[PDB]
Amino acid sequence: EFNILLATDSYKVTHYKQYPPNTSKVYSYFECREKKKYEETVFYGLQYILNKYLKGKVVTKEKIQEAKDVYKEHFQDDVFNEKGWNYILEKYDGHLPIEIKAVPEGFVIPRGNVLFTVENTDPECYWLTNWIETILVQSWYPITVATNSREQKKILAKYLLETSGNLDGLEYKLHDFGYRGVSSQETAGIGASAHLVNFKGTDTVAGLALIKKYYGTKDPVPGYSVPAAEHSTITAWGKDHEKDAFEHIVTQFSSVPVSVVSDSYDIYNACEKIWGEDLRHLIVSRSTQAPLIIRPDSGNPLDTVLKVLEILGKKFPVTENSKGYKLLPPYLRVIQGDGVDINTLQEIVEGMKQKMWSIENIAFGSGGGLLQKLTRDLLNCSFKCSYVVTNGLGINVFKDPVADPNKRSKKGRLSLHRTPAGNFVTLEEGKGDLEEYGQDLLHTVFKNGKVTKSYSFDEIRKNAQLNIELE
Amino acid sequence: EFNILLATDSYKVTHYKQYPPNTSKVYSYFECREKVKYEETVFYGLQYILNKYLKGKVVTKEKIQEAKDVYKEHFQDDVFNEKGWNYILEKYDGHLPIEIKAVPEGFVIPRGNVLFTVENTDPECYWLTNWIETILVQSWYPITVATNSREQKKILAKYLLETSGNLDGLEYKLHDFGYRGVSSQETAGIGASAHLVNFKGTDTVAGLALIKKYYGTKDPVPGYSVPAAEHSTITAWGKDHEKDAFEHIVTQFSSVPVSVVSDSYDIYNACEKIWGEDLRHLIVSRSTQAPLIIRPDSGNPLDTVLKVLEILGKKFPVTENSKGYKLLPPYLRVIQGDGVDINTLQEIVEGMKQKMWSIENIAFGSGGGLLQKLTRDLLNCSFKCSYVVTNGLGINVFKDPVADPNKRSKKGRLSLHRTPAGNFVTLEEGKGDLEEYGQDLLHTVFKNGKVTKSYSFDEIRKNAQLNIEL
Ligand SMILES: O=C(NCc1ccc(S(=O)(=O)c2cccc(C(F)(F)F)c2)cc1)c1cnc2c(cnn2[C@@H]2O[C@H](COP(=O)(O)O)[C@@H](O)[C@H]2O)c1
Ligand SMILES: O=C(NCc1ccc(S(=O)(=O)c2cccc(C(F)(F)F)c2)cc1)c1cnc2c(cnn2[C@@H]2O[C@H](COP(=O)(O)O)[C@@H](O)[C@H]2O)c1
Numbered sequence A: 001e002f003n004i005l006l007a008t009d010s011y012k013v014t015h016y017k018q019y020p021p022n023t024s025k026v027y028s029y030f031e032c033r034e035k036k037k038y039e040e041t042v043f044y045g046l047q048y049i050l051n052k053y054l055k056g057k058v059v060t061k062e063k064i065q066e067a068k069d070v071y072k073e074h075f076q077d078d079v080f081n082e083k084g085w086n087y088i089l090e091k092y093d094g095h096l097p098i099e100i101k102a103v104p105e106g107f108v109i110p111r112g113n114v115l116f117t118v119e120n121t122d123p124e125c126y127w128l129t130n131w132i133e134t135i136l137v138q139s140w141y142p143i144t145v146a147t148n149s150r151e152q153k154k155i156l157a158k159y160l161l162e163t164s165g166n167l168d169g170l171e172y173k174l175h176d177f178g179y180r181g182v183s184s185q186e187t188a189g190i191g192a193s194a195h196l197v198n199f200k201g202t203d204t205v206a207g208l209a210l211i212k213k214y215y216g217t218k219d220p221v222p223g224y225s226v227p228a229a230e231h232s233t234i235t236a237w238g239k240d241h242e243k244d245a246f247e248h249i250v251t252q253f254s255s256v257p258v259s260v261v262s263d264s265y266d267i268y269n270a271c272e273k274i275w276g277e278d279l280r281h282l283i284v285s286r287s288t289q290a291p292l293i294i295r296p297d298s299g300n301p302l303d304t305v306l307k308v309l310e311i312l313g314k315k316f317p318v319t320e321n322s323k324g325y326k327l328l329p330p331y332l333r334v335i336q337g338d339g340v341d342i343n344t345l346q347e348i349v350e351g352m353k354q355k356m357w358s359i360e361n362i363a364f365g366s367g368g369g370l371l372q373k374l375t376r377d378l379l380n381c382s383f384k385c386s387y388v389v390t391n392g393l394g395i396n397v398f399k400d401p402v403a404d405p406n407k408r409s410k411k412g413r414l415s416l417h418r419t420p421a422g423n424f425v426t427l428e429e430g431k432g433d434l435e436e437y438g439q440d441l442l443h444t445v446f447k448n449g450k451v452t453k454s455y456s457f458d459e460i461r462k463n464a465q466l467n468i469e470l471e
Numbered sequence B: 001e002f003n004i005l006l007a008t009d010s011y012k013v014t015h016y017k018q019y020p021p022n023t024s025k026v027y028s029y030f031e032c033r034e035k036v037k038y039e040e041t042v043f044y045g046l047q048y049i050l051n052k053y054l055k056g057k058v059v060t061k062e063k064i065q066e067a068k069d070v071y072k073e074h075f076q077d078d079v080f081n082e083k084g085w086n087y088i089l090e091k092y093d094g095h096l097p098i099e100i101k102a103v104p105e106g107f108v109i110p111r112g113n114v115l116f117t118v119e120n121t122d123p124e125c126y127w128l129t130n131w132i133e134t135i136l137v138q139s140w141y142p143i144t145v146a147t148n149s150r151e152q153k154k155i156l157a158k159y160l161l162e163t164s165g166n167l168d169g170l171e172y173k174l175h176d177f178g179y180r181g182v183s184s185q186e187t188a189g190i191g192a193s194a195h196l197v198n199f200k201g202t203d204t205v206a207g208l209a210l211i212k213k214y215y216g217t218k219d220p221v222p223g224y225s226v227p228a229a230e231h232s233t234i235t236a237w238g239k240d241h242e243k244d245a246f247e248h249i250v251t252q253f254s255s256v257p258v259s260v261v262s263d264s265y266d267i268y269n270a271c272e273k274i275w276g277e278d279l280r281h282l283i284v285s286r287s288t289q290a291p292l293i294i295r296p297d298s299g300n301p302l303d304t305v306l307k308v309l310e311i312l313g314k315k316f317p318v319t320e321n322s323k324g325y326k327l328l329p330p331y332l333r334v335i336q337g338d339g340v341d342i343n344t345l346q347e348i349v350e351g352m353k354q355k356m357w358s359i360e361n362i363a364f365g366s367g368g369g370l371l372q373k374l375t376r377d378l379l380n381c382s383f384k385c386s387y388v389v390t391n392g393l394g395i396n397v398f399k400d401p402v403a404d405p406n407k408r409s410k411k412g413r414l415s416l417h418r419t420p421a422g423n424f425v426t427l428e429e430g431k432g433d434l435e436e437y438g439q440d441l442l443h444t445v446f447k448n449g450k451v452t453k454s455y456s457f458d459e460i461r462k463n464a465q466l467n468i469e470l
Helices: A010-017 A046-054 A061-075 A082-092 A123-128 A133-137 A140-164 A185-195 A206-214 A231-235 A239-252 A267-278 A301-315 A342-354 A457-463 B010-017 B046-054 B061-074 B082-092 B133-137 B140-164 B185-195 B206-214 B231-235 B239-252 B267-278 B301-315 B342-354 B457-464
Strands: A023-032 A040-042 A098-102 A108-110 A114-120 A174-176 A258-261 A292-295 A332-336 A362-366 A381-390 A393-396 A415-418 A424-427 A443-447 B023-032 B040-042 B098-102 B108-110 B114-120 B174-176 B258-261 B292-295 B332-336 B362-366 B381-390 B393-396 B415-418 B424-427 B443-447
Touching (some): A040 A140, A046 A098, A046 A133, A046 A206, A061 A082, A061 B206, A082 A123, A114 A123, A114 A415, A133 A381, A140 A174, A140 A185, A140 A342, A140 A381, A174 A185, A185 B185, A231 A239, A231 A258, A231 B381, A239 A258, A239 A267, A267 A292, A267 A301, A301 A332, B023 B133, B046 B098, B046 B133, B046 B206, B061 B082, B140 B174, B140 B342, B174 B185, B231 B239, B231 B258, B239 B267, B267 B301, B301 B332, B301 B342, B342 B362
Parallel strands (some): A174 A362, A258 A292, A292 A332, A332 A362, B174 B362, B258 B292, B332 B362
Antiparallel strands (some): A023 A114, A023 A381, A098 A114, A098 A443, A381 A393, A415 A424, B098 B114, B381 B393, B415 B424
């Protein structure tokens, strides 16, 4: 079972002794700090953390004792604040006297803005605010996955629109392949749910249960997949029987979309000689609702996509669309699912456009590049204290290192507002109380053990929409 | 609750219809594929996965029904192998008819060797072997962290030994700061546990409980920490009261080691004026078992460290050790806990050596660099089918993409052996049975729902030791 008393950075155990005496309030905020591109971030993931780790009775007699025992050995000393945790147990039945205010989930906010704030609601628990910093800062992950996934949707939108005149099938152009490429089962579910804010194609099943449990959708499931082969299901037939493998598989899944990895021995021979000659008759007969999706899985991503397309282009009736780009027959498509990140995704669709191929032909699968190859410093996610009350007086606090202006933090009580031009502004020093900037966009989502405002996964998807999808 | 029927990549759900008819055996293996850095990998993490996810009754009527309903919507079709999973439930009480053989945890193994193998023990369950690829492949992570952590230890060991003549305090030179910088709670523990194979300093509490539950140590805890400050505990005193903050903190922890971040406003001012003049009397009076550890947290990592050392070197009695390198008084140390990855760690210790500062002076804290900035392709961790039986006939299978020789997989039944020079070799095509290379070094660690071999965290630590340590 999970223990909130053991879910923090070790040194935070010793912090209650280091704040100024007579400190009754510690007020902290979280932001994706601006750097001197990712100019806007999707806010997603907090509601999961709140429901799974912060709400309800999170303190017990056994959990306090368990932590006391651990820290005594961990520190070789009794620095653990048993008193403070026992106070919460007895006064509030184990509920955290904490208030958290957050921008609605799905919201797209420019860098350098307050996304959420945290503060204690009982003066005895001044220390509790930054106790849970560590657990709250982990929200950087689903935020970063949702943001990076969405930036990739922008690229796909731009090229699909230019080469086809519309955005049909956009939400199925970037599929989640990274279940095996993430660090854990929990990360897999969280990361998969963040990708599904923007797209509908996933193979990371874990994300489905997370969304159903913490967010919910009107639809039965938020994400989908279709039958496909792996190297083991092709190679098991032995080297000389790749054709038999292919034939058995496309026949097994004759009436649904099927993807078949074709690079086990020679991708270019498979497309030209097996798919384009030997088994061609099994391809041109397929429904538009059940195409064959050819999957290369090695070589330079751009070059392999181009060459495969040129091969299929010569073995199949290729048409040209209204925009002037080449289009494969409806029963035949390609998915590039190896070495795809936001950088290579751009290189590929750009290269395809150069060679007059429509982005309608291609879908992408992304594993590590989607769910693992991200860090907290990509969006500069940071949780800092901006305001404290000591001796009844509230002072605005902040850091401002001489050698790095970028690491400077915000002063005092904060609020997020719409500017007159429809953009976003974060007001500092409690200036939001002057009410010259309309209503705070930060809503109370957590207070005293209770989740006070929730959003469904449908609302989040609506909020995270692209402008081009709106227009 | 965890459901293994939902713990795989979607397309693997459709795979039982794709193998050649009358397949009775699927046999697969895991290696850190070959490619001048990361030539050897620490095998760590499988035992966690085995216990938490694979052992015992992992199949129930309820998990089967739940999986059935999810996949019907997820595929918009009925493709889920309800029959196969029901067979496992009824024939083995939910225990996986699987055998897994693996190298001992902690073992350091050169790239391109079989680390573990998996095969089904029941013909009916040919499809099971690669169902669990996804969960087993996630062992890449603890493997990679343990490896990258150990490679950094080799770097620290070289420079500590060179500048101080010994390896005292090596296992406390790289501290785990990665709790907030990882993707989840589970990942935090796994990653922190992996780091603790090589070092003893961690701030990721979650790693301790995991080790105790899945590995176990003779000692009460496998990792340690000391009190320290954060920007919030300094800045809360207000800009004009940084001196007061520092003084309160060092006095609160006057008999234990304490680290204080000094870069909130002006790192070089705090080292020269506050620590070096105003509060100097509270530092020189501290015990060797309770030093102040100054912590910069901004600027160029190498440049900041050098300037800080030169500032402290001029305000404090500096000595010269037996190797001729400068050394702070024993009550005063430094920790660099910002911007530390394996690359910058090397840049800092080497730059320090060039300025004649001992590595005794410094410790490193690493967050994202240690536990997050890693991927599966760093060691090329891969799981592939090498052997199948169809119609009673054994076939040595493999992939070999024309456009990438590096992705070529191994053929047939595998085994791991010592060479006559005492190095590792992986034998293919069942050639291990010829007995020309001695006995297979892999051990059956999992068979039919039961863990059959496991290793204490103490034995893993022993196995992962550096050569210079031995
Ligand atoms: O084909 C796969 N899954 C089925 C599949 C089939 C077709 C599509 S699609 O063409 O987008 C499509 C079409 C129609 C409808 C849908 C819809 F969605 F509507 F149903 C989706 C999408 C998924 C597949 C294929 N390969 C996969 C994985 C997961 N891991 N890997 C492998 O592991 C690596 C992980 O990547 P990395 O970490 O190295 O970067 C990848 O490269 C692969 O080798 C999944
Ligand atoms: O000071 C901290 N912890 C206490 C602490 C103090 C001193 C040491 S030590 O000097 O190694 C030492 C000395 C004696 C005994 C031990 C022993 F071990 F025996 F007890 C350890 C070891 C730990 C500390 C300080 N900062 C921390 C964290 C966790 N996260 N962060 C922040 O996270 C970022 C990580 O960077 P990034 O890579 O994610 O970008 C940093 O910038 C920090 O702001 C912990």
